[PDB]
Point group: D2
């Protein structure tokens, strides 16, 4: 039912559904089987940054994921979002765990979209969260996601002692719908940035974090824990 | 009831409910009887601009309204919004007509809010220079509609732009806004909109307001005319 | 001897130096002979818009030029600016006329650059001109460029009665140097937008407007009227 | 001489030229003798933030200085900058030391100005490099060490020295007011680390707005903060 475009930070290689044999970033267009991936050296316990950009001139979705003093990882894919997404969307973050686990902690998240009409003048939306509060009324929290423990967004369940739980799935969507494309626009673009902390006691953490864009009424597909990243109902 | 804070552009003197004898701008804190007003030379048929600022340092809410090549009107009122509004609000525009009438056309509308923690900033900004027929980031209430020439019409207008009496409508931004937090070192907002008030009448009525409300605010029952879509009565 | 990267709005086809036989937009990298071009239906007497973008992830310099209710012209070219420009640059607008002529009037100009450090996070510069004044001290005006007349920037000479003059050249550069790239940045980007009015009595108008980026001490090359667009010392 | 309007973070009380008897923040309008001050609990060794705003509606110049999990200090003064500053200005930061000393380290600095007839300028430094070509450095100020702006002299290990004055001005002139603007405004933010082995730190950091061609006045170390030719 939902229509999803996402950039995945995939910490667990599910080779049975197309993952390369290593932690990786990917661009997902209506499937969890990424259209493109790059290798990613997830650093356990350290704060990373994801920057995701798209513009309607190049029609190229790109992401860079990095840690301080490390080489970054980057992935790109040409896709016309006009032919994939509805013109109005919501944007969000998603994460899951499975039989393996990890914290999926968001420390900050920002987003900007702009749409300039062919007839006219620009419409714009920007938000910035550098801290999250206990009752963050501009976020739609879905599943296991919580805010206001450390000023952070915990996308998946963490116990009292700080231990991440398995088989957890959670999402945060920005409250306002976003006009992501319009035929009568000369230029359209967005960017999203978040910082994250993925920690695990395991030697294999799972399953990852994504930034996504979806139909406004999107909900966690039932059973989308583990390798499905709270994003898809199946591995097709 | 709702909790409202507004800047009104009040085109019709209702001197029986404490309006001054002339079109004016005002600052409304939980009442249509403005805490402070200034005289406003409304120009029928011209596009004007309204600008509103508040910051938690001065705890002063100010507004300026102007037209090109004319002197502006300004009003300011000291108020601590921490003690008036809930922590989370929605922001909007409202307009009304009564026996007399006018177009309440919004050509653009922008808003920025920032909150700096006491242990970095959170911000929200939006900018509308065009409105579309299905503008899913706006809550439209009452008679407000979008899309005619890319404008937001707050109150009823016919197919050729002629305004109608007894109309009230509002447009709210979809996302709630964190307007204050006692743990913030500084909080500020700013709103700007451009508007076109035109009337065939000798006296146009009733005005446009920028407002901040409880998240779940709706037009109060009966609040056409002098009540500007904001308040349940004239107290 | 200057180092120039530019987007040209070329109104005059100089086919003897590689222009296509039509008004066009182009990407110039250290040469007036554009590395890539697209056809451009320049509309005499109408206010156009130019929008230029670059980011360090895609390393793609792109431009879209349009008029209300017309289809737009777009051009893109892969180039790694780190290997072209100095680390610090100035940005500007340039125009010329030759034996044929046109007004090269700029009505607005805005620019934003950002540089996020590998170690830290982000430095930014933004400027916006929606009107120009008689003594616009944050602009360096070169040659025939003037400000103030109608709140506009006139890049090339216009006479007392509004007639554009032949054999003119002038530029406007933003006063502050811009840090455009940095080896230790995780991501870098800029955008520029300007609106322009190109008007001519001439059967064929000439010669064009560019947005350019240069060494900070850049000056108009002597003799760079006409096809050289105030940018280059020769047609190489 | 120069025309200055500044917000001082004054860490040393010069009671002989009219400082109150404690660390304070002040609004200085063409004199080092603040038009208004507020007490300020400087916390030696901690990173602090200063925020400065002005808008042409209220025509009030205000500032807040604070540290995390401590009360803030605020000061305000009604002034028509139209009548004080030239139309075009530079904006900067200044600091000084004297007989007593302190680090005058700047970790970030941002600035935004707008004029509606909107024209706008914004810059943000969250890191300073060894060769920061969009800054004019004056006197002792340096950039690059740990990615910070050191306004006054410090040794290789970070020990501050006496008798130091330095400033950093943003390269581009700013159109701070225009008589035919409906609304004009600005905002400045910086974060700073004032640390000192002394039991008495001195002398302070200021954000200032000046004539375009403004330079450190001769002699203006110590209590004069790099801004003023004398204490009048
Ligand atoms: O968490 C690791 C792994 O665990 C299980 O095998 C499933 O829940 C997968 O979907 C998941 O990727
Ligand atoms: O519209 C003008 C005026 O008309 C009537 O007198 C009433 O409906 C008022 O509420 C309104 O202010
Ligand atoms: O101006 C049109 C044309 O005129 C002359 O031939 C020269 O000055 C050329 O450089 C220019 O392109
Ligand atoms: O540094 C503290 C103090 O030291 C000396 O007494 C002088 O240089 C003053 O100008 C300064 O305020
Ligand atoms: Ca996986
Ligand atoms: Ca009234
Ligand atoms: Ca040519
Ligand atoms: Ca002092
Ligand atoms: Mn994967
Ligand atoms: Mn009133
Ligand atoms: Mn060419
Ligand atoms: Mn003092």
């Amino acid at each position: 039912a939902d229509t999803i475009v996402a950039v995945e930070l995939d910490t667990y290689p599910n080779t049975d559904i197309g993952d390369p044999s290593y932690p990786h970033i990917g661009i997902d267009i209506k499937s969890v089987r990424s259209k493109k991936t790059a290798k990613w050296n997830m650093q356990n316990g350290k704060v990373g940054t994801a920057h995701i950009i798209y513009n309607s001139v190049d029609k190229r979705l790109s992401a860079v994921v990095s840690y301080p003093n490390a080489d970054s990882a980057t992935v790109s894919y040409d896709v016309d979002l006009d032919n994939v997404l509805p013109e109005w969307v919501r944007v969000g973050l998603s994460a899951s765990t499975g039989l393996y686990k990890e914290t999926n902690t968001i420390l900050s998240w920002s987003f900007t979209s702009k749409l300039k009409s062919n007839s006219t003048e620009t419409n714009a939306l920007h938000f910035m969260f550098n801290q999250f509060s206990k009752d963050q009324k501009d976020l739609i929290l879905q599943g296991d996601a919580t805010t206001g423990t450390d000023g952070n967004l915990e996308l998946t369940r963490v116990s009292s002692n700080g231990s991440p739980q398995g088989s957890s799935v959670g999402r945060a969507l920005f409250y306002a719908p976003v006009h992501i494309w319009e035929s009568s626009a000369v230029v359209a673009s967005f960017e999203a940035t978040f910082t994250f902390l993925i920690k695990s006691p395991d030697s294999h953490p799972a399953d990852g974090i994504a930034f996504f864009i979806s139909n406004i009424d999107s909900s966690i597909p039932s059973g989308s824990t583990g390798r499905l990243l709270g994003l898809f109902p199946d591995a097709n």
